[PDB]
Amino acid sequence: ITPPSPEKDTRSAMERYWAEDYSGPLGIQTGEIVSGSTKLPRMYLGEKLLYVTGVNCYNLFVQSFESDGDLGLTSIRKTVDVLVEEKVPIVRFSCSPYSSGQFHFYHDNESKYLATLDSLAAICDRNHIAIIPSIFWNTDAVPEYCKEEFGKWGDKSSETYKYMLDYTEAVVNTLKGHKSVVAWEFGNEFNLQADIPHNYRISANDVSVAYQGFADKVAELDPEHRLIASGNSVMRDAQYNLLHNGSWTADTFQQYIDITSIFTPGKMNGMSEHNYEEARTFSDLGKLGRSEQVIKAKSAAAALGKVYYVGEFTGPKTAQGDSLVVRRHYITYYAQKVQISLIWNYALKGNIEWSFKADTPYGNMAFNLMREYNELFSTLSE
Ligand SMILES: [Cl-]
Ligand code: NA
Numbered sequence: 001i002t003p004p005s006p007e008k009d010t011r012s013a014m015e016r017y018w019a020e021d022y023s024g025p026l027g028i029q030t031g032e033i034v035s036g037s038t039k040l041p042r043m044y045l046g047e048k049l050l051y052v053t054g055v056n057c058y059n060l061f062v063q064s065f066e067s068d069g070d071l072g073l074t075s076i077r078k079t080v081d082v083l084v085e086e087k088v089p090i091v092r093f094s095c096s097p098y099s100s101g102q103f104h105f106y107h108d109n110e111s112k113y114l115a116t117l118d119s120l121a122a123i124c125d126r127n128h129i130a131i132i133p134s135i136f137w138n139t140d141a142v143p144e145y146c147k148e149e150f151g152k153w154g155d156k157s158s159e160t161y162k163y164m165l166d167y168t169e170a171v172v173n174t175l176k177g178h179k180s181v182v183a184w185e186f187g188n189e190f191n192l193q194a195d196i197p198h199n200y201r202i203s204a205n206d207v208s209v210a211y212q213g214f215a216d217k218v219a220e221l222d223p224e225h226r227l228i229a230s231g232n233s234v235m236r237d238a239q240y241n242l243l244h245n246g247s248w249t250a251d252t253f254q255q256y257i258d259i260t261s262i263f264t265p266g267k268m269n270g271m272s273e274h275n276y277e278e279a280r281t282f283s284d285l286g287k288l289g290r291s292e293q294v295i296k297a298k299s300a301a302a303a304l305g306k307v308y309y310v311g312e313f314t315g316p317k318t319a320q321g322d323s324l325v326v327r328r329h330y331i332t333y334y335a336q337k338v339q340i341s342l343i344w345n346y347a348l349k350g351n352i353e354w355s356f357k358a359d360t361p362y363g364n365m366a367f368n369l370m371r372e373y374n375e376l377f378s379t380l381s382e
Contacts, residue, residue: 056091
């Protein structure tokens with residue numbers, strides 16, 4: 001028989017994506033579910049609507065030189081074995097050295113470093129692990145390496161901005177052929193560095209310029225046009241007012257959409273937030289619980305043509321072992337049909353801040369919840 005259409009396919013998104021007969025676009029695609037003129041932007045994988053929960057594995061790649069010291073695969077393979085055994089479907093990881101003092105692991109021999117990254121992606125292909133590289137994890141590091149002030153991220157003529165383009169090109173060219181790579185994320189929590197009155201280093205508009213240059217370069221190189229994401233935390237309550245007035249006045253909802261747009265520009269359609277044990281407050285709507293915060297974030301995303309995801313949220317070590325604190329996140333994300341949510345943080349040896357490892361009480365707490373909620377997500381549709 002002729003194979004059935006994507007909607008006629010009874011398999012799930014991840015199952016259809018990872019099947020041997022899949023020959024569709026790689027990575028997360030943005031489509032829309034339509035009711036008349038209403039187009040709700042939504043994530044697709046394997047041509048079906050995606051709903052999944054996974055983990056951060058911050059050091060999935062960088063452990064190859066930060067821990068193993070040789071750009072080898074010893075710890076990577078041990079880590080992937082755990083991810084497979086625990087049934088982790090999706091992982092976010094850092095795709096660059098945290099410190100400029102370790103940039104030599106790339107520049108000493110660029111082809112060796114990129115070969116280890118290619119190998120990681122190949123291992124994830126074979127083991128059916130979807131990964132999201134977060135390319136400029138610590139935004140301090142590139143300006144430091146270039147002996148430039150941090151604001152040069154927003155200056156297209158700077159060595160910092162050139163390095164961003166050159167490194168983006170290197171990563172995308174290495175990874176674009178791998179079906180495990182499902183999205184490209186700029187870096188980690190860049191928005192939190194902007195417009196701080198008593199720590200004044202960069203403006204939201206400068207960050208936006210870097211995001212726009214990143215997204216344009218990725219779009220130029222990636223024939224699969226998979227999701228380009230920010231890696232932002234939540235916007236600060238006052239994110240817009242810090243930029244425009246240098247004040248800590250909580251933003252209105254309209255101002256939140258505005259500043260979200262600055263921090264998710266152009267071709268960057270992945271609206272990341274990180275959900276800590278902190279509430280969202282609007283000057284007009286007030287202080288909200290997490291359910292209403294997610295509903296408001298998804299409403300902002302939809303209006304902007306973006307898709308929301310929770311790139312980090314509270315894990316067992318941050319919760320001091322209170323499973324109810326963690327469970328509250330999963331309850332909300334399932335109820336509000338959040339399409340990707342990633343708990344902080346799995347580390348092979350548990351040696352990353354606020355992280356868990358396998359076969360411990362905190363590890364089991366996280367992985368049991370992850371499996372429990374992927375079982376519920378696995379039938380979700382809209
Ligand atoms: Cl490490
Ligand atoms: Na642990």
